[PDB]
């Protein structure tokens, strides 16, 4: 496990101490505090000492070219007799080999420790972020959604890992440049400055690119976040989007977000491609200008000078034109993270109640609670009652102390428990979610479980109450998680219970069972302040408080094959472009090798010669080799991005069109998060990291092949050692790779519980903060953070274990080239050896990176496969057929079912059979029956959500013989759950612009909603809150009624919806629906039978068969009818009223 100096608690507490200290100094000054200053003051002392590695390592990198000059010098002055020289030359090859091993170790030590340093910063920052989140002020939480905080950990803090890697090169790079300039000066004189002048033009330009890249990346994130939030509501709402046929509107909305987003990605990618192209060509330019100026100044090319100089510039090429720019960009990216984090860190952060008045926000036109005056004492039940918005839940929040008085006073005695109306549940076992860290005891537990009506589900769960649960309770039903949430509070045996209408979360039988056995009986000794709409229970309450107008008013995977690679490339461009993509890659490297070979050839030719070389020839071909290198290096870089970004564009469009036409069965099988991960996570890789990692891999891979090719071209005998040395690499790689994918698997699975704990906590915050549970919930995060730290730690160490041994076989290659040249020295010339050795030394950093990036590519291809499979989903029958209805159709509104059979899957059971019925024009019909009898399947048949067997007719057209959008648009659905989609009210009422603004207000008047919209500052064009949060559920259902009122249609289907409205407004829309749709034929699924008893017929489903379909009075006068038995099951008063109503209405409807 992770040792104490890396453990979450210790490591986050340290930086927090410096943050609090910096706040105090800023407050003593005038200035705003700086989180960057706190980080430096925390970590500088341990980070600076790592600079010793870079100091010694870079000193070695400048010495190693000087040794190489003395080895090459043996071939220039060669004499086969003079053994004393031969022994000395063997001495330098030993020193050069020692340099190579020392340099390899120092490089691995430095890069190891800076990567630990970055890990610690991340771990400390996550601890700070989570510690803040518990304490956020209840009003200041309203301006930052849970997903925005979770994005801090997911995206923003993961930058700090990268920041620490390159910072030392901000000084070591420039200093090395100065030293390298001084070294070159002794070797090639003033011509040194020509190469440095290029270098000091590159430095600003590459730094500006890094700044401008960061700005584009920041401006892109807004579109990506908007696309993901929109795509989340598409995937979550997909049945409603289908039934309204609104697919065209979300296609347009996602299309244009993606079209904006992809344009910034392209530009961004070209910038980043230009940066990495610069690193490729930089030395080739620097060397070109240096030796071009050198020969115009009258100097002559000699092998020793060239390859020493080439090797020195190679040092500068890493530090100044790769590592220094990488620092600037990653520091730039750091500050955007620090800025967003700082803004979060600076966010705001017996019972008696008398004169109590309070504001949730002083900008409110009134206090949000006012003048409350009541008290309650042990043994009493207080019921809190009143309309919507009367402040009932605010009263509980006041007694809980989350809402302090602006006037009046509150006091409480004994232990407090609070139960929120929305259920909350976390991971662990469901019993653990009930115990909440208390000790288990059967004797209290069984009493709690039976009083909470919860026993049956804890038996039927697949491992009972020891079933493991998801971090937000997604593994439980609403009624289960509600009772689990209540059972937790009831287990606490508290003295004051604050109950925010948990009874509203469950069915009426369960509600009274909870009220009787728990609230009345088990809690009998205790103060209960129960908010509930269960006003029918009030006879049992000891006292009753009625609120109105805000005041008191009354009192009483794993592996991927070649097929995925071919598809990924070919999806982006025609194969002709891909062949050209390969060719420019080869040509880039060939020109790159040939430029260095040309210097070697020129050095050899100068050695053969008074007479002198024709500079127009040698300097001419030199200039063409360089220019071709530059041109292909640029084009190669850009074209990789063009193809791979175009591939992501094509695969997104194909995937999105598939998900739109995919049948609902696809979403019944795959949970929402698993689909959305393709769009957010997998396409995120394809847009960003994957194209860069391909270019990074391809560019290094070709250079490794270039080094080995150069060596075998000069010293063919190397092919003999290279066979064993190759075999060793294959065995080593084979052995590593399997453990490599084990730790990448382990790393992934250990990361996700961290983010899932933050989101779990943020939803539950009114619970965990109530029971004083902040300390325990910190240690839970520290545990998950610590377990992830092990897998990350193992990933780091295993990566270095591998890389160290790859550098051992690289060092054997260098040793073979260095001594092999001295053994074979009769046969090969100084410029050949200088070429071969110079190339061999470059291998040391390069080869281990090439082989590790290979695994990165392989690992990310799993994302590519996971999206390609979604391009191949089965499709619904098309939107419009070759046959199409006449525009007058439908016109009567006949529907017929004839021998209809339905199942949700072809291998699934039938859930409607032989269903055969007529629905006449302007007739009114209700659907009734048992739970699971098939009621929901009747909608699914008629909308063809799954294709029925048999015949369905609408106005004598078979619904199978017309397009889905012909059918779906000519019907109107009022769904049970409302949805308001993000956007304006105008879009939510009309996404296609076919109703006039006059008509839209006429609709908004007829639903009696206009005034509350005119109170909004932008009126109909105002942006609604996410999910409609600025409206209650009943208010949102008014907007669904408005859509149906606007869309003129003959046939209306009502999905049991109005019973979810508040009773004083359920009755209102029930009245409106009778008024407005008098001209329609009407279908209505309903539980609250009193809402349909008037209808001309009712349909009763027993189980998959339509057993009754008749006039409701004619049903009820059959006392043996299922419909009678159902109303008889409601209760005597209900059955009397219903039967009386049926008799009266049936008589009246027989009079005409």
Nearer to ligand P2E, 60 or 427 (CB): 60
Nearer to ligand P2E, 845 or 963 (CB): 845
Cα distance between residue 489 and residue 419, in whole Å: 7
Nearest to 1056 by CA among 1075, 1043, 1037, 1030: 1037
Rule CB under 6 A: say whether 846 interacts with ligand P2E: yes
Sign of CA dihedral 1058, 1061, 1066, 1072: negative
- Taking residue 342's Cβ as centre, other Cβ atoms within 10 Å add up to 17
Nearer to ligand P2E, 96 or 806 (CB): 806
Cα distance between residue 749 and residue 178, in whole Å: 47
- Window of 352-360, 416-424, 538-546, 842-850 that interacts with ligand P2E by CB under 6 A: 842-850
* In the complex, minimum distance from the CB of residue 125 to ligand P2E, in angstroms, rounded to a whole number: 22
Nearer to ligand P2E, 296 or 801 (CB): 801
Q: Please, are residues 662 and 612 in contact by the beta-carbon 8 Å criterion?
A: no
Rule CB under 6 A: say whether 876 interacts with ligand P2E: no
Cα distance between residue 550 and residue 192, in whole Å: 81
Nearer to ligand P2E, 601 or 849 (CB): 849
Residue 446 CB contacts under 8 Å (≥ 6 apart), including other chains: none
What phi, psi does 1130 have (nearest 5°)?
Answer: -65, -40
Nearer to ligand P2E, 313 or 622 (CB): 313
- Window of 298-306, 423-431, 692-700, 704-712 that interacts with ligand P2E by CB under 6 A: 692-700
* In the complex, minimum distance from the CB of residue 690 to ligand P2E, in angstroms, rounded to a whole number: 14
What phi, psi does 681 have (nearest 5°)?
Answer: -80, -55
* In the complex, minimum distance from the CB of residue 1023 to ligand P2E, in angstroms, rounded to a whole number: 41
Nearer to ligand P2E, 836 or 1061 (CB): 836
Nearer to ligand P2E, 112 or 897 (CB): 112
Nearer to ligand P2E, 193 or 846 (CB): 846
Q: Mask 321-340, x = binds ligand P2E (CB under 6 A)?
A: -----x--------------
- Window of 135-143, 378-386, 694-702, 945-953 that interacts with ligand P2E by CB under 6 A: 694-702
Among 290, 600, 647, 699, binds ligand P2E (CB under 6 A): 699
Give the distance, in angstroms, between the CA of residue 1034 and the centroid of all CA atoms in the same chain: 31
Cα distance between residue 670 and residue 668, in whole Å: 6
* In the complex, minimum distance from the CB of residue 318 to ligand P2E, in angstroms, rounded to a whole number: 6
Among 161, 187, 233, 696, binds ligand P2E (CB under 6 A): 696
What are 958's strand-pairing partners? 953
* In the complex, minimum distance from the CB of residue 700 to ligand P2E, in angstroms, rounded to a whole number: 5
- Window of 647-655, 695-703, 758-766, 934-942 that interacts with ligand P2E by CB under 6 A: 695-703
Sign of CA dihedral 124, 126, 127, 131: positive
* In the complex, minimum distance from the CB of residue 132 to ligand P2E, in angstroms, rounded to a whole number: 32
Cα distance between residue 937 and residue 904, in whole Å: 8
The secondary structure of 25-78, three-state, reads HHHHCCCCCCHHHHHHHHHHHHHHCCHHHHHHHHHHHHHHHHHHHHHHHHHHCC
Q: Mask 790-829, x = binds ligand P2E (CB under 6 A)?
A: -------------x--------------------------
* In the complex, minimum distance from the CB of residue 846 to ligand P2E, in angstroms, rounded to a whole number: 4
* In the complex, minimum distance from the CB of residue 44 to ligand P2E, in angstroms, rounded to a whole number: 23
What are 409's strand-pairing partners? 354
Nearer to ligand P2E, 314 or 991 (CB): 314
**Which residues 255-294 are close enough to bind ligand P2E by CB under 6 A?**
none
Angle at 653 between CA 649 and CA 656, to 5 degrees: 135
Q: Please, are residues 828 and 714 in contact by the beta-carbon 8 Å criterion?
A: yes
Q: Please, are residues 967 and 884 in contact by the beta-carbon 8 Å criterion?
A: no
Three-state SS at 498: strand
Nearer to ligand P2E, 8 or 278 (CB): 278
* In the complex, minimum distance from the CB of residue 845 to ligand P2E, in angstroms, rounded to a whole number: 2
Among 16, 97, 102, 111, binds ligand P2E (CB under 6 A): 111
Cα distance between residue 721 and residue 723, in whole Å: 5
* In the complex, minimum distance from the CB of residue 694 to ligand P2E, in angstroms, rounded to a whole number: 11
Nearer to ligand P2E, 277 or 979 (CB): 277
* In the complex, minimum distance from the CB of residue 851 to ligand P2E, in angstroms, rounded to a whole number: 11
* In the complex, minimum distance from the CB of residue 135 to ligand P2E, in angstroms, rounded to a whole number: 38
* In the complex, minimum distance from the CB of residue 1035 to ligand P2E, in angstroms, rounded to a whole number: 53
Q: What would the two tokens of residue 134 be?
A: 């518990």
* In the complex, minimum distance from the CB of residue 428 to ligand P2E, in angstroms, rounded to a whole number: 38
Cα distance between residue 604 and residue 818, in whole Å: 20
Rule CB under 6 A: say whether 712 interacts with ligand P2E: no
Cα distance between residue 717 and residue 708, in whole Å: 12
Nearer to ligand P2E, 225 or 858 (CB): 858
When CB distances to ligand P2E are compared, the closest residue is 845
Residue 125 CB contacts under 8 Å (≥ 6 apart), including other chains: 12, 15, 157, 160, 341
Q: Count the residues of the shown chain that bind ligand P2E, applying the rule CB under 6 A.
A: 10
Cα distance between residue 902 and residue 909, in whole Å: 9
Say which residue the tokens 């393709």 belong to: 678
* In the complex, minimum distance from the CB of residue 1012 to ligand P2E, in angstroms, rounded to a whole number: 55
CA distances from 216 to 212, 262, 333, 1031 (A): 6, 12, 11, 36
- Window of 411-419, 564-572, 634-642, 693-701 that interacts with ligand P2E by CB under 6 A: 693-701
* In the complex, minimum distance from the CB of residue 857 to ligand P2E, in angstroms, rounded to a whole number: 13
Q: What would the two tokens of residue 978 be?
A: 């409302």
Three-state SS at 754: helix
* In the complex, minimum distance from the CB of residue 313 to ligand P2E, in angstroms, rounded to a whole number: 13
Note if the bond before 805 is cis, omega within 30 degrees: no
Rule CB under 6 A: say whether 845 interacts with ligand P2E: yes
Nearer to ligand P2E, 54 or 761 (CB): 54
Concatenating the DSSP letter of every residue in 233-286 gives: HHHHTHHHHHHTTTHHHHHHHHHHHHHHHHHHHHHHHHHHHHHHHHHHHHHHHH
Cα distance between residue 674 and residue 235, in whole Å: 11
* In the complex, minimum distance from the CB of residue 93 to ligand P2E, in angstroms, rounded to a whole number: 22
Rule CB under 6 A: say whether 856 interacts with ligand P2E: no
Q: Mask 643-682, x = binds ligand P2E (CB under 6 A)?
A: ----------------------------------------
Nearer to ligand P2E, 803 or 1126 (CB): 803
Q: Please, are residues 636 and 273 in contact by the beta-carbon 8 Å criterion?
A: no
- Window of 144-152, 436-444, 845-853, 1122-1130 that interacts with ligand P2E by CB under 6 A: 845-853
Nearer to ligand P2E, 628 or 693 (CB): 693
Among 700, 760, 1091, 1095, binds ligand P2E (CB under 6 A): 700
Cα distance between residue 1073 and residue 1091, in whole Å: 11
Site residues for ligand P2E per CB under 6 A: 111, 318, 326, 696, 699-700, 803, 845-846, 849
């Amino acid at each position: 496990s992770v040792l104490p100096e890396d453990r979450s608690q210790h490591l986050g507490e340290e930086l927090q101490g410096y943050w609090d200290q910096e706040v105090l100094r800023a407050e003593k000054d005038a200035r705003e505090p700086s989180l960057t200053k706190a980080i430096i003051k925390c970590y500088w002392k341990s980070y600076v000492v790592l600079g010793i590695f870079t100091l010694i390592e870079e000193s070695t990198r400048v010495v190693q070219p000087i040794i190489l000059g003395k080895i090459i010098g043996y071939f220039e002055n060669y004499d086969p007799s003079d053994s004393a020289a031969l022994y000395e030359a063997h001495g330098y090859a030993g020193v050069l080999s020692a340099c190579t091993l020392v340099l390899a170790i120092l490089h691995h030590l430095y890069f190891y420790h800076v990567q630990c340093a970055g890990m610690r910063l991340r771990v400390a920052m996550c601890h700070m972020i989570y510690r803040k989140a518990l304490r956020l002020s209840n009003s200041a939480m309203g301006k930052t959604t849970t997903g925005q905080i979770v994005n801090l950990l997911s995206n923003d803090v993961n930058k700090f890992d990268q920041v620490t890697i390159f910072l030392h090169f901000l000084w070591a790079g420039p200093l090395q440049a100065i030293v390298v300039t001084a070294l070159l000066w002794m070797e090639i004189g003033i011509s040194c400055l020509a190469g440095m002048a290029v270098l000091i033009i590159l430095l600003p330009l590459q730094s500006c690119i890094g700044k401008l890249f960061s700005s584009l990346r920041s401006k892109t994130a807004a579109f990506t976040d908007t696309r993901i939030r929109t795509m989340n509501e598409v995937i979550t709402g997909i049945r409603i989007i289908k039934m309204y046929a609104w697919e065209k509107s979300f296609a347009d909305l996602i299309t244009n977000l993606r079209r904006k987003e992809i344009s910034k990605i392209l530009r961004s990618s070209y910038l980043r491609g230009m940066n990495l192209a610069s690193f490729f060509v930089a030395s080739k330019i620097i060397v070109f200008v240096t030796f071009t100026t050198y020969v115009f100044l009258g100097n002559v090319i000699t092998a020793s000078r060239v390859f020493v100089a080439v090797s020195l510039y190679g040092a500068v090429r890493l530090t100044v034109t790769l590592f220094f720019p990488s620092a600037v960009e990653k520091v730039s990216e750091a500050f955007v993270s620090i800025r967003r984090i700082k803004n979060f860190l600076l966010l705001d952060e017996i019972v008696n109640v008398q004169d109590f008045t309070a504001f949730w926000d002083k900008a409110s036109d009134t206090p949000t609670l006012q003048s409350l005056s009541f008290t309650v004492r042990p043994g009493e039940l207080l019921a809190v009652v009143g309309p919507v918005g009367a402040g009932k839940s605010s009263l509980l929040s006041a007694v809980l102390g989350e809402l302090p008085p602006n006037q009046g006073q509150v006091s409480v005695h004994g232990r407090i428990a609070y139960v929120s109306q929305q259920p909350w549940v976390f991971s662990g076992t469901v019993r653990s979610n009930i115990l909440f860290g208390k000790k288990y005891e059967k004797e209290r537990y069984e009493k709690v479980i039976k009083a909470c009506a919860l026993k049956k589900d804890l038996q039927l769960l697949e491992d009972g109450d020891l079933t493991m649960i998801g971090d937000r309770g997604t593994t439980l039903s609403g009624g289960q998680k509600a009772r689990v949430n209540l059972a937790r509070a009831v287990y606490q045996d508290a003295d004051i219970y604050l109950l925010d209408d948990p009874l509203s979360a469950v069915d009426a039988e369960v509600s009274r069972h909870l009220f009787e056995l728990c609230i009345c009986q088990a809690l009998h000794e205790k103060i209960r302040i129960l908010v509930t709409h269960q006003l029918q229970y009030l006879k049992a309450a000891s006292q009753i408080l009625i609120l109105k107008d805000g005041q008191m008013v009354q009192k009483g995977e794993g592996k991927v094959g070649f097929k995925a690679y071919k598809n990924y490339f070919t999806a982006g461009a025609h194969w002709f472009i891909i062949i050209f993509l390969i060719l420019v890659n080869l040509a880039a490297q060939v020109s790159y090798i040939l430029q260095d070979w040309w210097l070697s050839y020129w050095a050899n030719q100068q050695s053969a010669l008074t007479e002198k070389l024709d500079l127009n020839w040698y300097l001419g071909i030199y200039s063409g080799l360089t220019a071709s290198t530059v041109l292909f290096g640029i084009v190669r870089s850009l074209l990789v991005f063009f193809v791979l970004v175009s591939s992501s564009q094509t695969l997104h469009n194909q995937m999105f069109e598939s998900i739109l036409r995919a049948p609902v069965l696809f979403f019944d099988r795959n949970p929402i998060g698993r689909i959305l991960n393709r769009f957010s996570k997998d396409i995120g890789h394809m847009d960003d990291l994957l194209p860069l990692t391909y270019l990074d891999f391809i560019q290094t891979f070709l250079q490794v092949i270039g080094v080995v090719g150069v060596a075998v071209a000069v010293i063919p005998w190397i092919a003999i050692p290279l066979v064993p040395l190759g075999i060793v690499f294959f065995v080593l790689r084979r052995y590593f790779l399997e453990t490599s994918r084990d730790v990448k698997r382990l790393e992934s699975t250990t990361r996700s519980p961290v983010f899932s704990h933050l989101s779990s906590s943020l939803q539950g915050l009114w619970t965990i903060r109530a029971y004083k549970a902040e300390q325990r919930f910190q240690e839970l995060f520290d545990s998950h953070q610590d377990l992830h730290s092990e897998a990350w730690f193992l990933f780091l160490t295993t990566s270095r274990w591998f890389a160290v041994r790859l550098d051992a076989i690289c060092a054997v290659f260098v040793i073979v080239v260095a001594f092999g040249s001295l053994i074979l020295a009769k046969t090969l010339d100084a410029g050949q050896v200088g070429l071969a050795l110079s190339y061999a030394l470059t291998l040391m950093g390069m080869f281990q990176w090439c082989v590790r990036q290979s695994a990165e590519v392989e690992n990310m291809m799993i994302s590519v496969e996971r999206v390609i499979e979604y391009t191949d989903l089965e499709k619904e029958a098309p939107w419009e057929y070759q046959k199409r209805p006449l525009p007058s159709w439908p016109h009567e509104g006949v529907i017929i079912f004839d021998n209809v059979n339905f199942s949700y899957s072809l291998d699934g059971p039938l859930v409607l059979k032989h269903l055969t019925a007529l629905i006449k024009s302007k007739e009114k019909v209700g659907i009734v029956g048992r739970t699971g009898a098939g009621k929901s399947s009747l909608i699914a048949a008629l909308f063809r959500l799954s294709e029925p067997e048999g015949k369905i007719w609408i106005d004598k057209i078979l619904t199978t013989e017309i397009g889905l959008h012909d059918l779906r648009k000519k019907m109107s659905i009022i769904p049970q759950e409302p949805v308001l989609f993000t956007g304006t009210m105008r879009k939510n009422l009309d996404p296609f612009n076919e109703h006039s603004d006059e008509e839209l207000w006429n609709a908004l008047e007829e639903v009696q909603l206009k005034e509350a919209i005119e109170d909004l500052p932008g009126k109909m064009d105002t942006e609604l809150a996410e999910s409609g949060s600025n409206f209650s559920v009943g208010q949102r259902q008014l907007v669904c009624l408005a859509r149906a009122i606007l869309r003129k249609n003959r046939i209306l289907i009502i999905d049991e919806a109005t019973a979810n409205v508040d009773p004083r407004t359920d009755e209102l829309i029930q009245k409106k629906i009778r008024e407005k749709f008098a001209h329609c034929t009407v279908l209505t699924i309903a539980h609250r039978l009193n809402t349909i008893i008037d209808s001309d017929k009712i349909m009763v489903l027993d189980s998959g068969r339509l057993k009754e379909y008749d006039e409701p009075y004619v049903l009820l006068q059959n006392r043996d009818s299922l419909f009678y038995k159902m109303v008889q099951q409601l209760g005597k008063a209900e059955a009397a009223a219903l039967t009386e109503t049926a008799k009266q209405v049936y008589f009246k409807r027989n009079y005409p």
